[PDB]
Amino acid sequence: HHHHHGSMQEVTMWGDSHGVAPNQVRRTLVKVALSESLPPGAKQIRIGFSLPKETEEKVTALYLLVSDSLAVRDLPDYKGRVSYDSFPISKEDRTTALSADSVAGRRFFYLAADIGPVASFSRSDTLTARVEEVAVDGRPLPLKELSPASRRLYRGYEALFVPGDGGSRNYRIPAILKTANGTLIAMADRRKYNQTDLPEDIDIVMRRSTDGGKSWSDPRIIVQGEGRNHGFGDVALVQTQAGKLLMIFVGGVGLWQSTPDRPQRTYISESRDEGLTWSPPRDITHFIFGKDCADPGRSRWLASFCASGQGLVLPSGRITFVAAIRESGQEYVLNNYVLYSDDEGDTWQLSDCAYRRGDEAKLSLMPDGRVLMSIRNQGRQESRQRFFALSSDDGLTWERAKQFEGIHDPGCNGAMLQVKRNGRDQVLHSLPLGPDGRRDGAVYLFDHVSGRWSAPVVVNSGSSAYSDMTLLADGTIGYFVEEGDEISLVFIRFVLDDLFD
């Protein structure tokens, strides 16, 4: 019901549940939106709030931020693209007021905090606050609460690619690599004009860290899209046994538009200096499929792409990525084959078929030397579970491995890590929890000996999609995930006990 005796200002508020890390500045705890500007006759807005002792103990300062923009992420994540004023509050106070002139017509208010240096990082190590009152010239307004605040502390948490960064509207498709020397390489689709895939015009962008993810270089475009049907994306990364970094990606038309005579092409580029410089992209499509393929039985295949994220370099030195290949123009179906090189990338071959009606697939090395492959469930097949397969000949031949099944896949890319926990060999697997949607990015542990999956632990609640993972030299896990409906690519660091103990 809407009344007809004047204008009705409405107040909406959201508690924040993005992760945080020690020493971060101006982290949003609660956002408040007015439905309209303060009336011209207004003089002051007062905001009262609650903040428990445990959160107060973990912050060094509080602020009221005021912006003309209603932003999804912490305001410094937009690097000045969101303009805001910052009004300090003693961390002991529970109310604050601003003149209407200071507010200057703006509608969006952020209760924010500087995070202190300490944390235990346990599941219970979370920050919260609540806005309790919003009053204009002493008159309280009814508050519409849409979410509670709960920000979990992680050993590291940083949005590496945020919509607008560098002038790119959007970002998707995370890939992370740790080199033998400890360098971290983070790549992404720089989705410059919107969030859609090829044949849209897309670049590949990179950031590097030489201090374990504490700080990151300015983003660099390393492969520039040149127009619709001429973009590049879907990066996967390895480091070869010789030490060179190898990135594989696709470019051109979209997957379902690719044909044998006009393919969406697969390229590789290498770095011999920890990701500083990269070789001009080399087209390797002819090793895989299409009119230039020397295997006549693959010359009529239509499309191929390797799963974004990471490949796998075997102890022998064989370099592997799983391709998802379209063999027929009649159907929207893909089959998986391992794309591999035994000569440091000079030439490439295909395994026997690893999975029928597959999709983006990933490899990891079992403790006994076998290769485990994890296949995305496309089209809600069977019981909507993640699919698995095993190879005992270093990836040449495959058999379905139903014993690894037991986790739901809403239909999304994810990653695995082989880990040892309390003396047991286990596989960590990242996926959205769903169910049946891109929501709540989670990790699970599979115990090799019992054949049982753990309960999931949600790393990032809310909208969540592709994830990649790497082991850092000191045993911490780096988790690189698509957060939000308008995606930011976020790098989170934790140890397993932080999530499962």
What's the structural blueprint in terms of helices and strands?
Elements: E1 11-15, E2 27-34, E3 44-50, H1 53-56, E4 59-67, E5 84-89, E6 95-99, H2 100-103, E7 108-115, E8 126-127, E9 130-136, E10 139-140, E11 143-147, E12 151-152, E13 156-161, E14 170-178, E15 184-191, E16 203-209, E17 220-223, E18 232-239, E19 245-251, E20 265-271, E21 282-283, E22 303-306, E23 309-310, E24 312-313, E25 319-326, E26 334-341, E27 349-358, E28 361-365, E29 371-375, E30 387-391, E31 399-400, E32 415-421, E33 424-432, E34 439-447, E35 452-453, E36 457-471, E37 477-483, E38 488-494, H3 496-500
Parallel strand pairs: 1-11, 18-23
Antiparallel strand pairs: 1-2, 2-7, 3-6, 3-9, 4-5, 4-7, 8-12, 9-10, 13-38, 14-15, 15-16, 16-17, 18-19, 19-20, 20-21, 22-25, 24-25, 25-26, 26-27, 28-29, 29-30, 30-31, 32-33, 33-34, 34-35, 34-36, 36-37, 37-38
